[PDB]
Design a protein around this ligand. Structure first.
Ligand SMILES: [Zn+2]
Ligand SMILES: [Zn+2]
Length: 44
């Protein structure tokens, strides 16, 4: 899984947007508030 924020890996917790098709964030990008205006699921 590739982070749509930074093009890096999504290892550990994956943050998947519940609105967009196929939009995933890594924990660094999530913690920096990228794509914060949509509800996401965080799963281990
Ligand atoms: Zn990232
Ligand atoms: Zn989204």
């Amino acid at each position: 899984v590739i982070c749509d924020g930074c093009n890096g890996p999504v290892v550990g917790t994956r943050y998947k947007c519940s609105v967009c098709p196929d939009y995933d964030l890594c924990s660094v990008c999530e913690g920096k508030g990228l794509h914060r205006g949509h509800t996401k699921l965080a799963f281990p």
